């Protein structure tokens, strides 16, 4: 459990939580990000 491995787990857990929290909004965010580029 290096500092790097633990920091990785910090952001992964919050990103997972955000996706679970509002899946329809993140799905559209992803569409909009793709269309932007």
């Amino acid at each position: 459990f290096s500092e790097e491995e633990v920091r990785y787990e910090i952001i992964l857990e919050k990103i997972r939580g955000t996706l679970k929290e509002r899946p329809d909004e993140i799905a559209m965010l992803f569409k909009l990000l793709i269309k932007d580029e």
Binding site: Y8, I11, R16, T18, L19, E21, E25, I34
Partner: protein, 105 residues
């Protein structure tokens, strides 16, 4: 250096599949069920093709999306780690740590 080169040529759709791979099947299924078929086709294709990407490239992708969610208010916790990533990018590892120590106090 090769990883860096490979990271900067990922399309946004490739980055999204790499993010989805790392969050796991259950959470990925939740996103895919709210996408249109053409979006699901493209993202599903990259999940199959980018399975087993280097973990360091995946971590760099997560950090990129972490900053997006912080700046748009989807994530309102973990400010310390966000600061740590920001200061490391802007000041480098060793001056960022001296800021970080003062920042935690």
């Amino acid at each position: 250096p090769k990883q860096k080169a490979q990271l900067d040529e990922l399309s946004m759709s490739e980055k999204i599949a790499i993010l989805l791979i790392q969050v796991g099947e259950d959470t990925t299924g939740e996103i895919l069920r709210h996408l249109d078929i053409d979006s699901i086709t493209e993202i599903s294709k990259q999940i199959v093709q980018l399975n087993g990407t280097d973990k360091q490239i995946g971590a760099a992708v997560l950090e990129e999306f972490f900053a997006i969610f912080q700046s748009n208010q989807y994530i309102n916790t973990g400010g310390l780690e966000y600061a740590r990533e920001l200061l490391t990018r802007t000041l480098g590892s060793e001056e960022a740590k001296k800021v970080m120590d003062k920042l935690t106090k």
